[PDB]
Design goal:
The complex is a heterododecamer, with 6 copies of chain A and 6 copies of chain B. Chain A has no helices and no strands. Chain A is low in regular secondary structure. Chain B is an all-alpha fold. Chain B has 2 domains: 1-144, Human Immunodeficiency Virus Type 1 Capsid Protein (Orthogonal Bundle), CATH 1.10.375; 145-214, Non-ribosomal Peptide Synthetase Peptidyl Carrier Protein, Chain A (Orthogonal Bundle). Chain B contains 11 helices and 2 strands, in the order ββααααααααααα. Chain B has helices at 12-25, 31-37, 44-52, 58-78, 96-99, 106-114, 121-139, 156-170, 174-187, 191-200, 206-212; strands spanning 2-3, 6-7. Chain B has a two-stranded antiparallel sheet with strand order 1-2. In chain B, strand 1 (2-3) and strand 2 form a beta hairpin. In chain B, helix 4 (58-78) packs across helix 7 (121-139). Chain B is elongated and about 75 Å long. The chains are: A little secondary structure, B mainly alpha. The interface between J and L is medium-sized, with 16 and 8 residues. The complex binds chloride ion (12 copies). One chloride ion binds at residues 155-157, 210, 213-214 of chain D. Residues 155-157, 210, 213-214 of chain B line the site of one chloride ion.
């Protein structure tokens, strides 16, 4: 499943 | 939302901000943090408010609905309900439909979020929504990381910009992203910069690479 | 509105926001959630304020008035009035006209909404208004779900966008919508995508269909 | 204004909002609700502030001044003044000029509005102003309801829009408006739609009429 | 006298 | 009667 | 300003609003109410802030400075100072320069305005400023009420608009304004409307005149 | 002296 | 800033307002009051925030830095430091660098401003900044008061506007400004208006002069 | 953020302000103070919110990520963890990942920032971010201070503006900046102004230099 | 030294 | 390492 787009969050 | 705890309505410019974000950026990656930023402490009613106010893009909103339904059914599976009258000093446990706000009143969500200990229904529903938005953003990416190659006249900085843009779009696990950065980034550079990056070494930072091909 | 309980006037940019929504989007489906979002905790006076400030579209506003009158008469039918002097420690029960705010003062609405137990007149009037707006949105839809067919050069994503746009406009029950999705969506696709969707199976998710005809 | 009770100054964007409304919509009907919406809980000083900040339209503002003077003189007639020193635990009764704020200080208006029992000077002055604005809006209407006739190529919805626009402008009593709706609306339709409306019957709702001539 | 423009108010 | 346009609400 | 009592800084959009008003409307009459509306409860420091932020129009700002100086010297004349050390439970009486805020600190103005009994220095300085602005607006009016005459093709409403615009600009006493309305308005109308107004009578209201020459 | 521009104030 | 005492961050539209002022008006005189108006009750951190956010004009910002350094060194000269451990019920005295906020924490500035008795570090730093801005505005004035002469076709009002614009730019002492007004203003007028102003007399007000040459 | 202590969500116009700053000014020096000004009292969650909402510039955002990782690993090196159950009256010490907010909840950050004594995780993460932004701004400067030379027709003020613009971009230590100002500024001026600056002397202020070459 | 631009302040 | 862009801060 996708890991998200929060690079720093 | 509920801020430190008092409950307020979703502000007009938060709504207008979210509508403008959906209109402008469509489903770019940064839309997801902005969403999360426009919905801090939000109840399920506020989240459904933001989702319902989206005009167009009804295919993506339908996919998001399907994802929310799946996560709800999974929640209900992991949390079986127990029959019995609700005690005067307690309150019922939410179902999957109550997390999404479809079958729960506003004061039930407030009572869930402010109780001791707290039941963070807004953040659960929020992470479900963010899952669906992740699937949408990943699906709507037009590019693949394998096709990002540096041009002969292209500066290194723009090439890195494209590369990490597509990389952020694909949303692969951090190990796979590490492999793509370690292999493809140097692999797909133009001959000169590629040679310089090879000479730099395997463990160079991005800063050293950009200042090397500067 | 009344937020957690203190009473405030309807803010200027909420008014301007609602007027701009009516001017821009006319009677698109998303106008109804926006309305609901611009009127959380609102008293009947605030709801009537939002409705009265609409310029033009007086046919739809008249239909909305008729719907509100019907719901009011039904409320008065289900709640017969009882004669007798109001006790010093109580307050009268609202009629249908008091819910709409036509024959009720502001402090009477506040006293109804803040009382223990509460009488949510703002939410009752609000759901009446939303009923009328549902009739208006359904009537003003120019298209029918039966006429949404995928073109030979049209990508699948745009076809699904049109389909669920009209579907949201028609406001049929969830079972009828389920039948329209299960039958018409695959039925009205172009030959190639139609064949692929037939090969996928009857219980495929929208995500699998879109990524299949991608 | 005075909100729940604390007193605040009239906000800048409320002023700018009212000025923009007067500039844009001139004296359309919806200007009156917007006015009422921009002045909730307002003291006479705030109402006079809104009126004084209007540039141009000085004929209408003069008519409004005359109406306010008439209502003030009538108030003073129905409330004769009684001589005597004001007691230390009481406060004087306002005259007609005090309601308009011409001869009353700000803290006198606050003391009138917050007293137990309350003297709502802001709402009295407000309804006087709304009376004058009603006379202005009625006078500035360019059309008459008798001249609204459906064209041969005109859809029914636009005809109803014009009809209820002029109807809202004329501000006749609800019985006279009922007669105009019952007689003129069907009477002044184009031949085909007129025949269909005749076939519908005398007690049809506007929704049934619009969906019939659709 | 005029009845006002408040259709719902 | 119409079911509304609140897809998620 | 100081609102109900807490002290706040002058908000950014109040400043920008006042600057925009001075840029747009120059010295039209309505600029004075807007000024008064943008400075409710304002300390002398806030008033001087609004005046100092005006770019250009330095002739009018200099005249306003002269008027403020005159009113200050008159205040000091009517309030002679008494020597003696200020008691620990009292505070000094302000001079003319302290009202304008030139020689008074912010907390001295706050202590003057919040004391029991109150010394309203902000409203005194405010009415001085409004006096100077009255002189400026009266001087900068390009027209005279004697030159406002109705054209042969001009509707009555526009003529009345011009007439009461100039009338508001001249700022004569209410008796002189009454004479100008009673004599010049009917006197300077075009032949036909003039005859009709003569036939109406001496004590007709403006509404009857406008609906008569309609 | 001028009487002001506050017609209603 | 710190308002009545609670501490808040500098608002976004205050920042944007200051940036827009610097971009639009450059170093016009009115920029200084606006600055002072956008920084009421501001801590040194807020003042340095406003100064640091200025893009371009780095020559003027460097001059301002030099002025701030001079005022800081002078402050440290007039306030010699005394060695010794800080008592548990006291707090240290600020140096010149602490006033500017370069070597002082935020809570140290708050503790300085809210202490009894107060140490107004924000207003000291603020008046230093305003000194530097005075030097910048005076230096960047392109004109001199000696060169402002009335044209043969120029109205008196525009000539006075130019004259007091340059006069405000030069920032000479009030006595020197008095001499420039008393001598140069009448001296540098065109022949006709000059003769009329000579006939008026030496002690005429600006209002009498403008209405005389009107 | 957390202001005086209550916790609020990051406001919409703060987000929009930061996005607009990144879009407009790219990585100019003043972007860093604006950032710091838009994030006062911000939790790590708010900082990560601001960073994540940046679209494009993914090379710089990746470099910033690397810098944040380095500072985190250094923090964990200087603060070794000690095993043991957390006491009921205490709370755990944050790791490097908790400062960045990647592995810490919101209420853990609030509990860290509001505790007595305080652990300022938001300001630590903030200074790490500002370090990375310093590296980015320094790297993205297109010019060098050695190449800023005054043209033969160029006024001195513009030359100083360019010089201190590049100087601010390079971010060298104050001693090196002192040497560049003392040597290069006078060295790289055009012949005439260079001679005048030589005649002024070694210890002249920038004001004296600009007014000398004026 | 300059006297400032605050005409009324 | 860079010293920052805060000239006055
Ligand atoms: Cl590069
Ligand atoms: Cl690309
Ligand atoms: Cl597709
Ligand atoms: Cl379609
Ligand atoms: Cl129709
Ligand atoms: Cl019409
Ligand atoms: Cl007319
Ligand atoms: Cl005219
Ligand atoms: Cl003149
Ligand atoms: Cl000039
Ligand atoms: Cl120069
Ligand atoms: Cl350059």
């Amino acid at each position: 499943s996708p890991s998200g787009v929060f690079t720093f969050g | 939302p509920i801020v430190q705890m008092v409950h307020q309505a979703i502000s007009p410019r938060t709504l207008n901000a979210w509508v403008k974000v959906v209109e402008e950026k469509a489903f770019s990656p940064e839309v997801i943090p902005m969403f999360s930023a426009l919905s801090e402490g939000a109840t399920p009613q506020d989240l459904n408010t933001m989702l319902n106010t989206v005009g167009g893009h009804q295919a993506a909103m339908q996919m998001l609905k399907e994802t929310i339904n799946e996560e709800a059914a999974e929640w209900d599976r992991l949390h079986p309900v127990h029959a019995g009258p609700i005690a005067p000093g307690q309150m019922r446990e939410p179902r999957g439909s109550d997390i999404a706000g479809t079958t729960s009143t506003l004061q039930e969500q407030i009572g869930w979020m402010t109780h001791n200990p707290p039941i963070p229904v807004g953040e659960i529903y929020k992470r479900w929504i963010i899952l669906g938005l992740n699937k949408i953003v990943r699906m709507y990416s037009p590019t693949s990381i394998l096709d990002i190659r540096q041009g002969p006249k292209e500066p290194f900085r723009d090439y890195v910009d494209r590369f990490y843009k597509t990389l952020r779009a694909e949303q692969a696990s951090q190990e796979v992203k590490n492999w793509m950065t370690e292999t493809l980034l140097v692999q797909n550079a133009n001959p000169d910069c590629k040679t310089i990056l090879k000479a730099l070494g395997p463990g160079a930072t991005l800063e050293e690479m950009m200042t090397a091909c500067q």
